[PDB]
Design an enzyme around this catalytic site. Structure first.
Site, PDB file in Angstrom:
ATOM      1  CG  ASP A   1      44.539  69.930  16.014  1.00  0.00           C
ATOM      2  OD1 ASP A   1      43.637  70.880  16.782  1.00  0.00           O
ATOM      3  OD2 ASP A   1      44.151  69.031  15.464  1.00  0.00           O
TER       4      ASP A   1
ATOM      5  CG  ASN B   1      52.092  72.843  14.473  1.00  0.00           C
ATOM      6  OD1 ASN B   1      51.177  72.078  13.760  1.00  0.00           O
ATOM      7  ND2 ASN B   1      52.033  72.627  15.798  1.00  0.00           N
TER       8      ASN B   1
ATOM      9  CG  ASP C   1      48.513  70.663  11.054  1.00  0.00           C
ATOM     10  OD1 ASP C   1      47.939  69.533  11.118  1.00  0.00           O
ATOM     11  OD2 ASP C   1      48.947  71.051  12.058  1.00  0.00           O
TER      12      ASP C   1
END
Length: 218
Positions: free
Chosen positions: A25, A135, A23
């Protein structure tokens, strides 16, 4: 890279190549748009005929992290961002190293309960050989056995989460099925494995950690 023993090097050739899905962001970067640490780079993208500027901050040690894990895994970017943003960010993170060229964006996600789920089978349908670092727990709602959780990052300069993951990611690649390790992460029992196959994967996983311990403890 810590030296590979003969048994570990032989082991690597008997297991399949693996993919590490990343990922962007709040996993590797954090950005904020128009509206005090200086940013690492500034992105200018046109979105709906509107120039927009993003101030992008790199998580500590991301460049070193990417340089290291790219020797162990095929890296794939799976972001819930729009492609115009995600592609520009990945290009800057790559910085001409040609390790982040494979990308998937929002159009490959499905929104459920406010979370963009990332179907790993879009990247690779052999679930023994694909891992995702994200996250957002909702991102791997459909593939929990293939997920490595990581704390969200916004600005904490003392963060070392990416460094702390390197020994595990190193040892993980000696397994035949990554789920042998990640599925652990019945509860009354003290079992670590549920089959001889999984037990073999945990032995290979621990063998590599053993090589780390005897370089660090001493």
């Amino acid at each position: 890279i810590l030296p590979l023993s003969p048994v570990s090097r032989n082991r690597l050739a008997q297991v399949k190549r693996k993919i590490l899905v990343l990922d962007l962001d709040e996993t590797l970067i954090h950005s904020h748009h128009d509206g005090g640490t200086p940013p690492d780079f500034i992105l200018k993208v046109v979105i709906d005929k509107h120039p927009v500027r993003f101030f992008v901050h790199k998580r500590p040690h991301v460049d070193f992290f990417l340089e290291v894990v790219s020797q162990w895994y095929e890296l794939v970017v799976f972001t819930a961002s729009m492609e115009i943003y995600g592609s520009a960010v990945a290009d800057k993170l790559d910085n001409s190293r040609s390790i982040l060229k494979r990308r998937y964006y929002r159009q490959h996600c499905t929104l459920e309960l406010g979370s963009y789920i990332k179907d790993l089978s879009v990247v690779h349908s052999d679930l023994s050989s694909i891992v995702i670092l994200d996250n957002s727990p909702g991102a791997y709602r459909s593939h929990p056995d293939n997920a490595i959780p990581i704390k969200s990052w916004f600005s904490d300069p003392s963060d070392t989460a990416l460094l702390n993951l390197l020994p595990m990611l190193d040892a993980l690649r000696f397994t035949a099925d990554v789920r042998s390790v990640l599925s652990r992460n019945g509860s009354a029992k003290g079992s670590e494995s549920n089959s001889l196959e999984q037990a073999e994967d945990l032995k290979a996983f621990e063998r590599r950690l053993t090589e780390y311990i005897h370089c660090l403890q001493a």
